[PDB]
Write a protein that binds this ligand. Sequence first.
Ligand SMILES: [Cl-]
Ligand SMILES: [Cl-]
Ligand code: NA
Ligand code: NA
Ligand code: NA
Ligand SMILES: [Ru+3]
Ligand SMILES: [Ru+3]
Length: 129
Amino acid sequence: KVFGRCELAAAMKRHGLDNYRGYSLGNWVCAAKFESNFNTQATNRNTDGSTDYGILQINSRWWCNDGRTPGSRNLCNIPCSALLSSDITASVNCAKKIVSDGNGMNAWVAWRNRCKGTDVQAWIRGCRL
Ligand SMILES: [Cl-]
Ligand SMILES: [Cl-]
Ligand code: NA
Ligand code: NA
Ligand code: NA
Ligand SMILES: [Ru+3]
Ligand SMILES: [Ru+3]
């Protein structure tokens, strides 16, 4: 599923991501924009052999099981394919664990490089929320 901007903002809010660990909704929408262009089916292989999955590009090195990332963990206790669903529940619940791990949203390199310190509220501007 390719979400609309305001559609994803609303789904993220319903799932409790708005202001989760202090990160306003626009931060999450901005991260999803640059990680996946709002496409739940996005996958990308990393140089270390792990793969990133879903709207928030969650990595198989630590967070989900894909059966092909040696020495990895599955800290969200989910198959990585669950992060590709049109229903964002699995991605949101796993993202909550990631953002609580110590470094906040810096876990998402694209958030740090493209959203952090910008006017992230623009990503939810105009949305009925
Ligand atoms: Cl915001
Ligand atoms: Cl980047
Ligand atoms: Na957009
Ligand atoms: Na894994
Ligand atoms: Na594996
Ligand atoms: Ru850690
Ligand atoms: Ru930890």
